[PDB]
Every structure is written in structure tokens, then in C-alpha cells.
Structure 1
Amino acid sequence: GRNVDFAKEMTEFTKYQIRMQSGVAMLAQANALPQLVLQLLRGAEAYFQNQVETATPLEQIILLYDKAIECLERAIEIYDQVNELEKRKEFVENIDRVYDIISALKSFLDHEKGKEIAKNLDTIYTIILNTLVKVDKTKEELQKILEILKDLREAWEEVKKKVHH
């Protein structure tokens, strides 16, 4: 899992860069299109979750990380059970949602304003997308991606705190 391991290392210094320049990090990432945010959070469900409309730009980013993490956690839980049709169904559905969310996050990056932070986020996201589509992606690779997303979510939470206080 060389590629995902590279992303793990890059996350270590990218979270540092985000901490050093919280303003730049916000400019880099907090450019979500609200219509796309609502659609991604709903997925195939019959209802939009409460109060998404009142979420700030940074809060919408955090909500997308929350949902990606939730879906990836579920996919990891059932990874070894995909011999069963219904388990494979749920696994593929969740992996596809993670792919859609990460794709959207990558599309929101402002490179002119975001500079090195935006470059490194794009690289991390690209590695994740390439891994998610791999037919023979391993459970270990998915677990490392989960850790990356949790670490980055924590970074965004700190950015939010710094902007608001």
C-alpha cells in the first residue's frame, strides 16, 4: 500500500500547514456549492438531514467529512463479508458515496488562494479516489484512508474554532 502510505505521510505535514495558516486553509477548501452539499449528504435517502441550510461554509466541509467517515466506517465493518449479496450491495453503495464526497471536496479546492495547502489536499484526495476505484483495494488501505479523513476533519474543526474565536 505504497500510495496510501504516501498519503499518510503527506497528511502529517498538511495538517501542520493547515494549523500554521488557518485563513489560507479556509480559502483553499471552504468553497462548497450548497446544492451539491445537500445532495451528497442525502445520498439515496428519502429525506434531507435537519439544519444543513444553517451550516456555514466551514461547517459544510465538516459535514461532508462526517458523512464520508460514517460511510467508510460502515464499509470497513463489512469488508470481509462481501461474499453475501446484501453485504456487497451495502459495501459498494458506501464506497461510492465516499468517492462522490471526496471528488466534490477536490472540486472545491481554490489553488490560487490555497497554494501549498490546496496542492497537498488535491494530492491526498487524488490518492484516495484512486484507491477507492481499485478492484483489489485492501482493508488496510481503507483503514489508513479512514485515519487520514479523521485527522483532516480534526484539522478543519480547529480551523473553524480559530475563525470563530
Structure 2
Amino acid sequence: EAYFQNQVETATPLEQIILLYDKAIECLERAIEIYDQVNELEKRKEFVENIDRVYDIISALKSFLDHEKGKEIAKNLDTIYTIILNTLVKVDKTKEELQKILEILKDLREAWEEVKKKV
């Protein structure tokens, strides 16, 4: 797999949204993979770095929402992202919670992709 950051400058606006999902899913997958290992110093460092990136990306995607023309898609999107964001800051969030976020991000990413191939 190619380094994501290097794809920005050949990416359409929609490909840029997908690249952000790709990155969020990859970080979320890693945080889930090491969730049980967080009593090792490094694994907890890694885990928090990754939840932070997933947060930063999801909070970026929310900030890109056009509620004017986006209409109801915008509003639902905002609603899903806020739940994710609110989960991700839970002190006591669980592995299964993160798994369901992962499932959402993947279903949404695949939608975005379907829209991509129609364009």
C-alpha cells in the first residue's frame, strides 16, 4: 500500500474524503488490535495516538459538512460523526464500541466509493 499523504495532490475532492476514511479505518483497526495490550507502555502510547488521529479525522470530516446544500445527508453525517466523536472521548469506551465504529466507517467508506465510480 502506497503512503496516503502522497496521494493528496492527485486526488479529487471525493478521493480526498475517501483517503481520510482509509486513514481513519487504518488507525481505528490498529487501536482495536492493541486494545488489550495497553498495560505495556508503548502499546498504550500507540493506542492513544491512534484514537487521537481517528478523532482528528472524524472531527475534520464533520467540519467539512455543508448543511445548506447537504440537506439531510449532511444532518445524518453530522449525527453519526458526533456519536463517534463522543464515544472516542469516553474514558471507559470498550473494544466492542470501537469495533462498531469501525463497521460504520467501513460502510460509509464503501458508499463514498460507489459515488466515486459513478463520477
TM-score, reference length from structure 2:
0.95
Specify the alignment match of 1:162 in structure 2.
Answer: 118
| 1:114 has 2:41 as partner | no
Per-residue CA deviations over 1:10-67 (Å, capped at 9, x if unaligned) read xxxxxxxxxxxxxxxxxxxxxxxxxxxxxxxxxxx99983232110000000000000
Larger relative contact order (Cα-Cα within 8 Å, sequence gap ≥ 6)? 1
Instruction: State the secondary structure of the residue aligned to 2:5.
Output: coil
Which runs of structure 1 show a deviation greater than 4 angstroms over 4 or more consecutive aligned residues?
Answer: 45-48
Specify the alignment match of 1:152 in structure 2.
Answer: 108
Cα offset, 1:79, TM superposition = 0.3
Structure with max Cα Rg: 1
Specify the alignment match of 1:55 in structure 2.
Answer: 11
For 1:98 and 1:160, locate their aligned partners in 2 and report how far apart those are by CA, in whole Å: 22
For 2:59 and 2:77, locate their aligned partners in 1 and report how far apart those are by CA, in whole Å: 12
Note closer, same or farther for the CA distance 1:91–1:160 as it changes in structure 2 (3 Å cut).
Answer: same
Task: Quote the sequence identity (%).
Answer: 100
Per-residue CA deviations over 1:101-129 (Å, capped at 9, x if unaligned) read 00000000001111110000000000000
TM-score, reference length from structure 1:
0.69
Per-residue CA deviations over 1:130-157 (Å, capped at 9, x if unaligned) read 0000010000000000000000000000
Note closer, same or farther for the CA distance 1:47–1:116 as it changes in structure 2 (3 Å cut).
Answer: closer
Cα offset, 1:162, TM superposition = 1.2
| 1:96 has 2:65 as partner | no
